[PDB]
């Protein structure tokens, strides 16, 4: 909520991503904190298996309820950290309801 | 420029990409939003930081706000705690 | 300090170009035999496979730590 990205660049989510889709090269962010400089999904390789939302120990990467995001080009599917973070700056009213709705079962 | 630089040099040919297009860049930099937060004052020497949640936040780590010299910062939230 | 990953002989190939995809900045490559690490169980069985397939080899002898005698009391002498 504060506004601090939740991703702490564990690499616990490309070590499991079976389609080998994620590259999250990181640095100390100059606050002394630990965050990504790089994050990636190639959405033309991902399989919507959710092995990344259940491995994330912080609930940073999720897999939202969109399914109307077809694209006329190949480049609009190679998501970067800023098409996933403002993406997550969009559905957070709609994600958290579903997380709070299923957290117990998970 | 993204919160992590990335700004293409004027000469970079890698700029055509954005012609008749634009650049996906998040305006909400977490370097600053977290600085726009009140240092969480505490009474105890050590404090927890579940990430403001149990199982909906980040792993729970105890921070040693033992020296006023430094406000402990949970490595996960970047929240400074003022002893 | 686990020694379970230093017990079987591996046959890895040379390291060729690992470059950058202009569009996304990923690492790209043209070496089909780059991720190849065949695992054998003895020098003899690795040299055989390489000779079998027509590759050139550079065997490196094993380097087991020699025995170093350790005693608790020794650090109490004066």
């Amino acid at each position: 909520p504060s506004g601090e990205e939740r991703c702490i660049a564990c690499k616990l989510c490309e070590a499991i991503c079976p389609a080998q889709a994620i590259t999250i090269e990181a640095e100390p962010r100059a606050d002394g904190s630990r965050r990504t400089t790089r994050y990636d999904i190639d959405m033309t390789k991902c399989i919507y298996c959710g092995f990344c939302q259940e491995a994330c120990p912080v609930d940073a990467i999720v897999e939202g309820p969109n399914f109307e995001f077809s694209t006329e080009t190949h480049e609009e599917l190679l998501y970067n950290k800023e098409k996933l973070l403002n993406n997550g700056d969009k559905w957070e009213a709609e994600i958290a309801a579903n997380i709070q709705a299923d957290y117990l079962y998970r | 420029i993204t919160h992590t630089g990335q700004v293409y040099d004027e000469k970079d040919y890698r700029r055509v990409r954005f012609v008749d297009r634009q650049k996906e860049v998040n305006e909400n930099f977490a370097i600053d939003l977290i600085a726009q937060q009140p240092v969480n004052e505490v009474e105890h020497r050590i404090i927890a930081c579940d990430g403001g949640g149990g199982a909906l936040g980040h792993p729970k780590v105890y921070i040693n706000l033992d020296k006023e010299t430094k406000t402990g910062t949970c490595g996960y939230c970047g929240l400074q705690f003022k002893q | 300090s686990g020694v379970n990953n230093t017990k079987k002989w591996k046959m890895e190939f040379d390291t060729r170009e690992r470059w950058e995809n202009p569009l996304m900045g990923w690492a790209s490559t043209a070496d089909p035999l780059s991720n190849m690490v065949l695992t054998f169980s003895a020098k003899e069985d690795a040299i055989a496979f390489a000779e079998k397939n027509g590759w050139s080899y550079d065997v490196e002898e094993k380097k087991v730590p020699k025995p170093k005698s350790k005693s608790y009391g020794a650090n109490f002498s004066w």
């Binding site: 994050y39 998501y79 800023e82 098409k83 | - | 569009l23 900045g25």
Partner: peptide
Amino acid sequence: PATPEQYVPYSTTRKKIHEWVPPSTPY
């Protein structure tokens, strides 16, 4: 409870190398 805004990728990486810039004035 044709569009120009098309996502375009980056290499958000800080360029990971530095070339010697030659000396500005001759010798």
